[PDB]
Enzyme design. Sequence first.
Site, PDB file in Angstrom:
ATOM      1  N   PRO A 175       0.820  -1.223   0.000  1.00 32.69           N
ATOM      2  CA  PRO A 175       0.000   0.000   0.000  1.00 32.69           C
ATOM      3  C   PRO A 175       0.849   1.265   0.000  1.00 32.69           C
ATOM      4  O   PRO A 175       0.734   2.142   0.860  1.00 32.69           O
ATOM      5  CB  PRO A 175      -0.816  -0.163   1.282  1.00 32.69           C
ATOM      6  CG  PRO A 175       0.114  -0.884   2.203  1.00 32.69           C
ATOM      7  CD  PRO A 175       1.034  -1.733   1.363  1.00 32.69           C
ATOM      8  N   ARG A 176       1.718   1.370  -0.998  1.00 32.07           N
ATOM      9  CA  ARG A 176       2.684   2.454  -1.098  1.00 32.07           C
ATOM     10  C   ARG A 176       3.254   2.432  -2.508  1.00 32.07           C
ATOM     11  O   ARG A 176       3.012   1.500  -3.282  1.00 32.07           O
ATOM     12  CB  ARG A 176       3.804   2.319  -0.071  1.00 32.07           C
ATOM     13  CG  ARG A 176       4.442   0.950  -0.065  1.00 32.07           C
ATOM     14  CD  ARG A 176       5.894   1.026   0.336  1.00 32.07           C
ATOM     15  NE  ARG A 176       6.492  -0.295   0.470  1.00 32.07           N
ATOM     16  CZ  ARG A 176       7.024  -0.974  -0.534  1.00 32.07           C
ATOM     17  NH1 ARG A 176       7.046  -0.488  -1.763  1.00 32.07           N
ATOM     18  NH2 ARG A 176       7.537  -2.178  -0.303  1.00 32.07           N
TER      19      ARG A 176
END
Lengths: 472, 191, 95, 95
Positions: free
Chosen positions: B9-10
């Site tokens: 999630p980046r």
Amino acid sequence: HMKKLLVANRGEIAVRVFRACNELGLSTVAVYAREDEYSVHRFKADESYLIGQGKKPIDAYLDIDDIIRVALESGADAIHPGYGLLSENLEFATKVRAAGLVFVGPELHHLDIFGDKIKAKAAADEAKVPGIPGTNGAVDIDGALEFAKTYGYPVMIKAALGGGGRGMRVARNDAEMHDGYARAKSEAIGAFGSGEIYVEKYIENPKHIEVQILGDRHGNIIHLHERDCSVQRRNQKVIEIAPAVGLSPDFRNEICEAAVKLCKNVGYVNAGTVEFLVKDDKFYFIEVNPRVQVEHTITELITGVDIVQAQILIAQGKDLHREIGLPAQSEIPLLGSAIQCRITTEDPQNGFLPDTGKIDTYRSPGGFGIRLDVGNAYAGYEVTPYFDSLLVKVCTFANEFSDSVRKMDRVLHEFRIRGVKTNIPFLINVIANENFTSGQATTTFIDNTPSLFNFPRLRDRGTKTLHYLSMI
Amino acid sequence: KFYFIEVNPRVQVEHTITELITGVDIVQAQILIAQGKDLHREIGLPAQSEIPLLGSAIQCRITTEDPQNGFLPDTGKIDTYRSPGGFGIRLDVGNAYAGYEVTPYFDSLLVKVCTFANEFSDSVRKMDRVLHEFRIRGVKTNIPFLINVIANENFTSGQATTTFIDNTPSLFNFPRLRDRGTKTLHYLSMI
Amino acid sequence: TVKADLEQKIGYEPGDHEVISYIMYPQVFLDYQKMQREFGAVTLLDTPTFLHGMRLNEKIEVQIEKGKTLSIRLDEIGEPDLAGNRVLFFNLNGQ
Amino acid sequence: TVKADLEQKIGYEPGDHEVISYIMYPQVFLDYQKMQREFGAVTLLDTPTFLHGMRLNEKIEVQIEKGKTLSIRLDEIGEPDLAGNRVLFFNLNGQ
Ligand SMILES: CC(=O)SCCNC(=O)CCNC(=O)[C@H](O)C(C)(C)COP(=O)(O)OP(=O)(O)OC[C@H]1O[C@@H](n2cnc3c(N)ncnc32)[C@H](O)[C@@H]1OP(=O)(O)O
Ligand SMILES: CC(=O)SCCNC(=O)CCNC(=O)[C@H](O)C(C)(C)COP(=O)(O)OP(=O)(O)OC[C@H]1O[C@@H](n2cnc3c(N)ncnc32)[C@H](O)[C@@H]1OP(=O)(O)O
Ligand SMILES: Nc1ncnc2c1ncn2[C@@H]1O[C@H](COP(=O)(O)OP(=O)(O)O)[C@@H](O)[C@H]1O
Ligand SMILES: [Mg+2]
């Protein structure tokens, strides 16, 4: 059959050809003058040899016999001339092909047809590509005055062997026409020997469009779209963009079609550039450059086609579409837009005179959409007045032209060259301008915008602090 | 057939090759999405079927892991740094310059280099060129290992799997490098 | 047996001349190999440079092979630190 | 007219304080402006650094702005050449 290639040039173009040769698996040979001993291109090749011993360094790089001698003793199969020194020289290419070495360039008839402007204009007339209405050959001073009478001012005086705006002058009245003819004559005998001045009709605020042409031995000739190099100062290119975002795609297609059909009529081979003058939806031929150009990088970025690699492979005799692998003309992609800036040592606060000195700071940007073709700009490099002012070519490319402008502004602010003055503040001023941003810039845009020469004061606090610390 | 493992999630380290093959600035779009802008209206990205595929791209991460020392991160003073450039080359350098003292505290990454081209074979050739053109002296790098991996036919065909390195001992054969500038300077300094 | 042992001791497969010189002068050949790995082919330097090194601001050119010439210039000799090391400021190939 | 003459003499539009200080001390303000153009804001240096410069292998930090701190280290002082110039080997901001 080729295993080793010599580059008869210097600076960033030599490194560019060296990188292309290494990608193609060939050996590289560099040449260098004594005053160019610290150039990066000398140390980027497998072999380097001193040339022109005792001569001036520019004359050392024009030592034709020494260059072929080095290429023969090094076992180089071919010679790539790059640009600016002997790329357009008929005598050098003739001697190279007579020595048995492959010349990475067009044919000899292409060279001596496109070398002189009036013969290139005759060839374009035979290809029926329209050009500037001008004299049918090199007229005299009186014939130039007669043309100024019948066709009317504005006219432009141009030499048939002029380069970089040397033999080119402007005229508004009769006496200034005489002065321009005399100055063009002096510049033609001084730098090129023979004065063959013609006179052409002057266009008010034209758009300078260049079309990149690739042709092989088999006769397949394609165009890699076009380049807009209208942003010029004293008729010298400053910022080049690709494609012409300020022009309609159909008009650009017409210009490209005229260029490729001119090159098809002359049967052109290898890489070449066709210069066109655009003014309200019509184009005029000016010249064909029978060499790779400085601004080929943005064409490679917007097309994906390695121009120097294809140049070498065409010199190998490979087919354009079968062995090299280039697609058909309708399948040549247009991957966004690109902008080229040449960072030089010209000081805009000193009349764009080339600054010399020792570079004590060099930081280069990177990241997405940024291409660097550095010359000799590293920290500790002593900039000499012998060679051209170029430090580093930088190209920014993106899907949208606005993002290319934003990336190039980021690059010009991220660049740090200290010790010598640069044209970076001028480039920042040109990039920030709304005419360039819209893409409707003309050849007169720089000369009619005095606000481009207003430069903010830079603090430069690291340099001053170090200077005071050294002082105390 | 494919199986999910995890979602990062980046932004990723290898977003560079994605933005090279698509033309879409991922970090710029990240910031503009954090500004609440719309993907296709304000950011300006096209629809899903119009997302371009501009050739192929390869990312190599040059680190201080010494492949002749079990890929341990080397430390020391960098005394030489030359970076390549030209067509199809993208550089995202970390802390890699002449005079930089590599510390054992942080990640071993020196410079991310990405090569992109219309064809994958041209991308491979450009990456071999830039791995040979790269010059980092003073600390050991993983460049010889990367050169070996780029040379392999399993990699160049695109059919590499996650077991390819562990089952190919020929990747760990490294040619002797002369390094004659360093040795000459060392002898001159000693005398 | 000697050739395999030497290929263990030095980092490559030796020639017949290397094997035979390792037989006569074992420690001398191994010390020569260690000095080759440390300082390289010092035989290419000129004799004043070979015996005396470099002076300040001197420019020397070392042809290491055909077509390759190292441009070496000694710009500054640093003062010795607490560890006894000196930093020598060279200009190798312009850099 | 004094303000216009000062805008001619120094490279920017001066403030009221600069104009009034140029009136009282004409040559002193112009010498201060020349030293500002050459050495910059030396008022940001600490006093031992301001008076004595920098020692060998000394590390100093100069805060030129909020969030901008110059890391300066003097690594080596070169010998003077024939023109009387010394090369000082600084390490500014890691470089
Ligand atoms: C432009 C491109 O595409 S570069 C692609 C890679 N090819 C090259 O770099 C060609 C130049 N050759 C070299 O740099 C090296 O000889 C290599 C990479 C082939 C071999 O690497 P090494 O064994 O470690 O270095 P080598 O012992 O052979 O050479 C010693 C020094 O002479 C330098 N040198 C290399 N070519 C030349 C030359 N024509 N003239 C003078 N010096 C040279 C090398 O850069 C090296 O200096 P360095 O420490 O800064 O790296
Ligand atoms: C990553 C990007 O997108 S780059 C876009 C802008 N480029 C930058 O470098 C941002 C950082 N800002 C700067 O470098 C400068 O302040 C600029 C470019 C805005 C102005 O340039 P100048 O007026 O000529 O120099 P300035 O007086 O402001 O700064 C003096 C020194 O402090 C340095 N410095 C800049 N930012 C910092 C910082 N955050 N911390 C410490 N030093 C810094 C500068 O690099 C400069 O050193 P230099 O001589 O090597 O260039
Ligand atoms: N007849 C003309 N009218 C108006 N502008 C011209 C005319 N001829 C040339 N120019 C401008 O001047 C520049 C001339 O440069 P050019 O002749 O291409 O340099 P070189 O001779 O080195 O190739 C062109 O970019 C063009 O925009
Ligand atoms: Mg022209």
